[PDB]
Amino acid sequence: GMSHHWGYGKHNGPEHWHKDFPIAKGERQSPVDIDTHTAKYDPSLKPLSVSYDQATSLRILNNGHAFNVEFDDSQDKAVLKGGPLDGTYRLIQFHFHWGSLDGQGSEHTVDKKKYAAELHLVHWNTKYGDFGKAVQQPDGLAVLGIFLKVGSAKPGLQKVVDVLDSIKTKGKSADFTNFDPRGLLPESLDYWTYPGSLTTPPLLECVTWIVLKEPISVSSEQVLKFRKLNFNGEGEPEELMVDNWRPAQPLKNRQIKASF
Numbered sequence: 001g002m003s004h005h006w007g008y009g010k011h012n013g014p015e016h017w018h019k020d021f022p023i024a025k026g027e028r029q030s031p032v033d034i035d036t037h038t039a040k041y042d043p044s045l046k047p048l049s050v051s052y053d054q055a056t057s058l059r060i061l062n063n064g065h066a067f068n069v070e071f072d073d074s075q076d077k078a079v080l081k082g083g084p085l086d087g088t089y090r091l092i093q094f095h096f097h098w099g100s101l102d103g104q105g106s107e108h109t110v111d112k113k114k115y116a117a118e119l120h121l122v123h124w125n126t127k128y129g130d131f132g133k134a135v136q137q138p139d140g141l142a143v144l145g146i147f148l149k150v151g152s153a154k155p156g157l158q159k160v161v162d163v164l165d166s167i168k169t170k171g172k173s174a175d176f177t178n179f180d181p182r183g184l185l186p187e188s189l190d191y192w193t194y195p196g197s198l199t200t201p202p203l204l205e206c207v208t209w210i211v212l213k214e215p216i217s218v219s220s221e222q223v224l225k226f227r228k229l230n231f232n233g234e235g236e237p238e239e240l241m242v243d244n245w246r247p248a249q250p251l252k253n254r255q256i257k258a259s260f
């Protein structure tokens with residue numbers, strides 16, 4: 001994507017993406033509003049299994065859109081299974097979407113409520129061998145989405161917050177070993193699920209979304225550090241990395257199912 005020019009500005013933001021990525025107007029785009037009254041309990045959903053005890057983080061990268069905490073996905077270490085999923089999905093990275101103000105930032109909404117931010121733990125289906133092959137399949141990825149609200153600090157997030165000073169600008173990375181993603185989970189694994197897409201270009205319709213009902217709390221100081229990151233590269237005019245979220249897309253011919 002060396003000739004990609006999409007972003008979150010007025011001239012290159014979500015309303016423009018369809019010109020280079022026509023699937024932006026597709027039949028299973030993400031995110032969506034979760035209408036809690038219309039979502040139906042599905043007693044057939046199997047238990048959700050988040051097995052992160054052997055997770056091996058490697059690095060954190062500012063990619064000019066968000067920051068990714070990257071994992072070693074060359075063995076079954078950190079895996080997601082159960083719930084709506086058939087087979088085994090390996091954790092490759094997590095990242096966040098967040099706002100300029102606490103009243104916006106999430107991609108999914110709940111009865112039109114926007115949270116301050118949203119965490120995406122990205123996993124790929126091991127039956128397709130590599131992430132690049134998985135994104136070409138309708139059941140290639142499983143993204144576990146977790147809402148953030150501003151209140152108490154999340155102790156398990158602080159190691160991420162403190163390293164951000166070293167990856168301020170696009171293209172900067174830092175070693176980020178021994179980070180435990182279990183420290184970012186809420187108590188309950190109750191969730192909603194639906195078939196959708198990547199929420200950034202290339203917007204591929206390859207994702208089973210699993211969105212947890214219980215948000216995690218982070219402090220105002222933690223999210224303020226996210227908002228000091230830059231979309232720009234070093235030695236370019238400063239553009240704060242804020243409002244890096246896609247709004248809700250049409251649900252079209254989809255049902256959202258509840259685990260609870």
Ligand SMILES: NS(=O)(=O)c1ccc(C(=O)N2CCN(C(=O)c3ccccc3)CC2)cc1
Pocket residue numbers: 120122131132135143197198199200201202204
């Ligand atoms: N917000 S999200 O969780 O839907 C999400 C997850 C992953 C990504 C991502 O990092 N990419 C989009 C898919 N993608 C590819 O299709 C790809 C392109 C080139 C080589 C290999 C893979 C990799 C980059 C973007 C958005």
Ligand SMILES: [Zn+2]
Pocket residue numbers: 095096097120199
């Ligand atoms: Zn995301």
